[PDB]
Write a structure and sequence with these properties.
It is classed as transferase. Keywords: kinase, indolinone, GSK3, ATP-binding, nucleotide-binding, serine/threonine-protein kinase, WNT signaling pathway, transferase. It forms a monomeric assembly. The longest helix has 19 residues, at about 120-140. With about 350 residues, the protein is of the alpha+beta class. The N and C termini lie far apart (about 50 Å). It has eleven helices and eleven strands. The strands form three sheets. It has a six-stranded antiparallel beta barrel with strand order 1-2-3-4-6-5. Bound molecules: the ligand CC(=O)c1ccc2c(c1)/C(=C(/NC1CCN(C)CC1)c1ccccc1)C(=O)N2. The ligand CC(=O)c1ccc2c(c1)/C(=C(/NC1CCN(C)CC1)c1ccccc1)C(=O)N2 binds next to strand 2, strand 4, strand 6 and strand 7.
């Protein structure tokens, strides 16, 4: 076996690097970011992920600066960070030692779809609540993920703990400062972004989460668009044609898509029979045309659909106890503090 010893700066605490050794490196991910590895530590024998990205002198890494401000159980923790040379030494890379999680929400949802089965509502409740909890934390700093999809939602099959990953698209949204329109994966792309909105709030992650929720309820994406324009046709097929005021509320740059008035399709008819009415009520308040009309991540966590997790007698289908879901902080509750009366039940008080 080959051992790799490097001096890496820890993500949290003071900027003081330490000698970190790792072995058994293998390629597990490949994307727009760069490359993701899986390595075993020499100290505890713990498995960690190493995301190698090509870095320049012109500026500092945007993802790294967002990552070392973040400390939450439902987001992959930045263990360490170091610099390596792999292009005749003239070009340098940024390696991010992050948490390793075996499965993803996509892979778990795929298992049921291939077996013609439905994902149990308890799993839909646990995965969605943890996504909105991590969203309430990132949005309190002004940071918007801009890439919410089941492939980026990591999963541990035994404990059922969800973790958010890939903060490359992520940016601290500021009022007045424009942003790029073509962002997020097509099936989870908000209608503002299709309408060419450069000025948007962190409510685009709320829409993307709503797209994931409906996907876990249907067993397939709700809006499978063939093109960038065919994506809006998929949305119009269930939500109907947006009103004059709904269009303006998205703040659209260069509009006039020229589509016929088809009108909204009932939410109950969209999903399978005997689908919990609370899931539909939640999905209706997340997948809204008007971004300001959408439920906030904390408001989504306080919804009637996640009341089963708030029960003191709730447990995982494998017998194990549900993870920490009520250990909220002042930074998490920052947007709406009186919501703590619903979010934190008397048993956990
Ligand atoms: C993208 C990023 O920033 C990041 C950060 C930390 C991470 C991962 C990704 C990650 C991934 N793990 C997969 C390993 C293979 N199994 C079968 C599925 C899960 C992974 C890799 C590529 C795409 C999506 C997810 C993990 O375990 N820890």
């Amino acid at each position: 076996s080959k051992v790799t010893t490097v001096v890496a700066t820890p993500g949290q605490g003071p900027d003081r690097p330490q000698e970190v050794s790792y072995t058994d490196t293998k390629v597990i991910g490949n994307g727009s970011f760069g490359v993701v590895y899986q390595a075993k530590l020499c100290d505890s024998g713990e498995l960690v992920a190493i995301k190698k990205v090509l870095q320049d002198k012109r500026f500092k890494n945007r993802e790294l600066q967002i990552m070392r401000k973040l400390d939450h159980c439902n987001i992959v923790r930045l263990r360490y960070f170091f610099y390596s040379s792999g292009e005749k030494k003239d070009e340098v890379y940024l390696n991010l030692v992050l948490d390793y999680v075996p499965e993803t929400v996509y892979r778990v949802a795929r298992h049921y779809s291939r077996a013609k089965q439905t994902l149990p509502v308890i799993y839909v409740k646990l995965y969605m609540y943890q996504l909105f909890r991590s969203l309430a934390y990132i949005h309190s700093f002004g940071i918007c993920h801009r890439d919410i999809k089941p492939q980026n939602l990591l999963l541990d099959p035994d404990t059922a703990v969800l973790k958010l990953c890939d903060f490359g698209s992520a940016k601290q949204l500021v009022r007045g400062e424009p942003n790029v329109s073509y962002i997020c994966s097509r099936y989870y792309r908000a209608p503002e972004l299709i309408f060419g909105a450069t000025d948007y709030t962190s409510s685009i992650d709320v829409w993307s989460a709503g797209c994931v929720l409906a996907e876990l309820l249907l067993g397939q994406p709700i809006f499978p668009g063939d093109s960038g324009v065919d994506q809006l046709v998929e949305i119009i097929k269930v939500l109907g044609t947006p009103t004059r005021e709904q269009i303006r509320e998205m703040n659209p740059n260069y509009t006039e898509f020229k589509f016929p008035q088809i009108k909204a399709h009932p939410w109950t008819k969209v999903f399978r029979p005997r689908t919990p009415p609370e899931a539909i009520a939640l999905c209706s308040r997340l997948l809204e045309y008007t971004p300001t009309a959408r439920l906030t991540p904390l408001e989504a966590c306080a919804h009637s659909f996640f009341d089963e997790l708030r029960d003191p007698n709730v447990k995982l289908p494998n017998g194990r106890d549900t993870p920490a879901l009520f250990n909220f902080t002042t930074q998490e509750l920052s947007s709406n503090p009186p919501l703590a009366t619903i979010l934190i039940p008397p048993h956990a008080r």
